């Protein structure tokens, strides 16, 4: 929200460079669940977290693509079975 608040001033490249590195471990986290579907978090910054195979949990950055990741990992994890 700090990006959309101020984007036409001198603090625009510094804030963009801050947000671009504040999401760098997040891309590794997503870079797991796109190809394998193995849980990685011990920080509480991840919202895809730990019957009929829907007993893992799921709860601003774009929530529109997160649920897609939650199901795109679980297919690869289904072919492990």
């Amino acid at each position: 929200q700090e990006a959309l608040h101020n984007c036409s001033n001198e603090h625009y490249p510094v804030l963009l460079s801050l947000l671009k590195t504040s999401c760098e471990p997040y891309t590794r986290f997503i870079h797991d669940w796109v190809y394998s579907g193995v849980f990685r978090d011990a920080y509480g910054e991840f919202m895809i977290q730990v019957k009929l195979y829907w007993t893992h949990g799921y709860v601003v950055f774009l929530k529109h693509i997160a649920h897609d990741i939650y199901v795109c990992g679980k297919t690869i994890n289904l072919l492990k079975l």
């Binding site: 984007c7 796109v34 950055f61 774009l62 297919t75 690869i76």
Partner: protein, 35 residues
């Protein structure tokens, strides 16, 4: 402009492959259509 959708286009192409494989995996191999 603030957009994070430029990365979604090199990602949705794999999202679609995974989804199509998931629906195909039931019917041609586990034979839910026969049941």
């Amino acid at each position: 402009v603030l957009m994070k959708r430029s990365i979604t286009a090199p990602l949705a192409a794999h999202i679609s492959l995974v989804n199509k494989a998931a629906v195909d995996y039931f019917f041609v191999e586990l034979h839910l259509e026969a049941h």
